[PDB]
Amino acid sequence: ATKAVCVLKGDGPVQGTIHFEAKGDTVVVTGSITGLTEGDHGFHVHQFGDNTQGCTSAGPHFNPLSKKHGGPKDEERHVGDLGNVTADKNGVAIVDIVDPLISLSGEYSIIGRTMVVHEKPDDLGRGGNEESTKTGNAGSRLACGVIGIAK
């Protein structure tokens, strides 16, 4: 598949629609998320597309290469590490990401997995603690959705 989509939903006011398109050896991620507190929010692909227990059942950050957490620009990062999305004063974040590691096909495809937007900013593994190199201290999962094949 060359296109994918994900509708984010949660137990709070946060919602959004994320679009994915394969371009060359990258995936262009677009869309928007609303209902967020002003500022940065961690944005990652989690391993399982399992919504049986809210966003908790999505598991850890997608990490097929068994690396530590990092920012999208780092060599040492989880495949699912897409950094931060930024919400304005009105709580709207416009997603504009081009990533070379996530894919929509092959062993490390994100189709069927989960997109999660977090409570706090992702410190990109530069927080000086063991949680920084695991989750980026992004906090709780505000909303998530299973990534599906799009027309």
Active site amino acids? 44, 46, 61, 69, 78, 81, 118, 141
Q: Which amino acid, one-letter code, is at 20?
A: F
Contacts of 47 (CB under 8 A, 6+ apart): 58, 59, 60, 61, 62, 63, 80, 113, 114
| Locus of tokens 């940065």 | 40
Q: End-to-end CA distance of the chain, in Å?
A: 9
**Which position among 30, 34, 51, 86 is part of the footprint of a copy of itself (CB under 8 A)?**
51
41 near Zn ion, judged by CB under 5 A: no
78 near Zn ion, judged by CB under 5 A: yes
Which residue's CB is nearer to a copy of itself, number 17 or number 39?
A: 17
**Residue 78 labelled as part of a binding site:** yes
**Residue 41 labelled as part of a binding site:** no
**Residue 69 labelled as part of a binding site:** yes
Query: Measured at the alpha carbon of residue 32, what is the angle toward residues 147 and 36, in degrees to the nearest 5?
Result: 105
| Locus of tokens 């505000």 | 142
At its nearest, how many Å lie between a copy of itself and the CB of residue 62?
10
Task: Report DSSP letters for 100-111, one per residue.
Answer: SS-BSSSTTB-T
Q: In the complex, which residues of this chain contact Cu ion (CB under 5 A)?
A: 44, 116
**Which position among 26, 28, 34, 48 is part of the footprint of a copy of itself (CB under 8 A)?**
48
Q: What burial letters (b/e) apply to 83-112, b meaning 16+ CB within 10 Å? A: bbbbbeeeeebebebebebbbbeeebbbbe
94 near a copy of itself, judged by CB under 8 A: no
**Which position among 5, 22, 28, 92 is part of the footprint of a copy of itself (CB under 8 A)?**
5
Q: Which residue ranges make up the site for a copy of itself (CB under 8 A)?
A: 1, 4-5, 7, 17, 47-52, 59, 111-114, 145-151
Name the residues that contact Zn ion, by CB under 5 A.
Answer: 61, 69, 78, 81
